[PDB]
Each structure stands twice: as C-alpha cells, then as structure tokens.
Amino acid sequence: LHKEPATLIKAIDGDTVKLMYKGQPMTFRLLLVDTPEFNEKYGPEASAFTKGMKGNAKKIEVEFDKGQRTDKYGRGLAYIYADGKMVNEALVRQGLAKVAYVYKGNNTHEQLLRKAEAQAKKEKLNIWS
Numbered sequence: 001l002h003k004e005p006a007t008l009i010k011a012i013d014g015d016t017v018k019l020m021y022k023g024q025p026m027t028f029r030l031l032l033v034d035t036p037e038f039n040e041k042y043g044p045e046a047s048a049f050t051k052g053m054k055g056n057a058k059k060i061e062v063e064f065d066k067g068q069r070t071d072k073y074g075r076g077l078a079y080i081y082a083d084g085k086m087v088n089e090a091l092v093r094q095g096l097a098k099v100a101y102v103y104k105g106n107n108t109h110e111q112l113l114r115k116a117e118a119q120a121k122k123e124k125l126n127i128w129s
C-alpha cells in the first residue's frame with residue numbers, strides 16, 4: 001500500500017472525514033473500524049477525537065487498501081493518517097472505536113488494529129469500561 005496526499009475539508013464524526021482528494025471533495029469512511037454514533041455513549045468523544053485533527057495535525061494522507069475504494073453510499077474507503085499516525089489505529093487504541101467491517105481484500109491492517117483493540121480492552125478504556 002501507499003500513502004497519498006489530501007487536504008482536510010471537515011471531520012464529520014468519529015470515523016467519517018471529508019477531504020479534498022485530487023481536487024475533488026470526497027467523504028471518506030475509515031477502514032476496519034466503527035465509532036459509536038453521536039447519540040450513543042462515547043460518540044461525542046470519538047467525534048471530538050477525530051475532529052481534533054484540524055487543530056492538532058498538519059499533514060493528512062489517505063491510503064487505499066487492495067480492494068473496493070468506495071462503499072455503496074459513495075464514500076471513499078481508506079486508512080487516514082495525520083502527521084503519520086494512523087487515525088484508524090488511534091481510535092481503536094483509545095477505546096473509541098471497535099474493529100469492524102472486516103472484509104478479505106480490504107484488511108491489510110487487520111492484525112495491527114486487533115492488537116490495539118486488545119490493549120484498549122485490557123485497560124478497560126472507554127467503550128471497554
């Protein structure tokens with residue numbers, strides 16, 4: 001896999017971000033993760049965590065996996081990095097998302113994320129509390 005530049009337009013919630021990608025606006029849904037909806041426990045927390053990338057980071061990059069690049073809603077499907085840190089991984093590590101939506105073909109970072117989830121679970125963090 002390879003990382004490509006993009007520009008943050010708006011972080012929407014915990015696992016959805018709108019980016020300018022090759023000059024066109026696209027809503028990206030983060031691969032392999034599920035944050036609570038905003039109306040559920042830890043939804044607001046995950047939303048603020050991801051939103052914080054606007055203030056807390058400088059360089060945003062997208063990395064597609066080897067399978068489908070768009071979902072049936074027209075959203076991009078990718079791993080998103082902020083100053084080199086994977087947002088997907090960070091959300092799972094903090095117990096703000098669960099590993100989810102795992103499809104063969106788009107699961108390159110599955111084991112990486114499951115490691116993060118196991119730590120967050122052991123610590124009884126947030127979702128796991």
Ligand SMILES: Cc1cn([C@H]2C[C@H](OP(=O)(O)O)[C@@H](COP(=O)(O)O)O2)c(=O)[nH]c1=O
Nearest residue numbers: 016029030031032033034071072077101106
């Ligand atoms: C992360 C991911 C989500 N999705 C789709 C399936 C879910 O739609 P359905 O329930 O209609 O199948 C939806 C979950 O998105 P949200 O978690 O953003 O609501 O996104 C994919 O199709 N592939 C993916 O890799």
Ligand SMILES: [Ca+2]
Nearest residue numbers: 034035036037
């Ligand atoms: Ca969600």
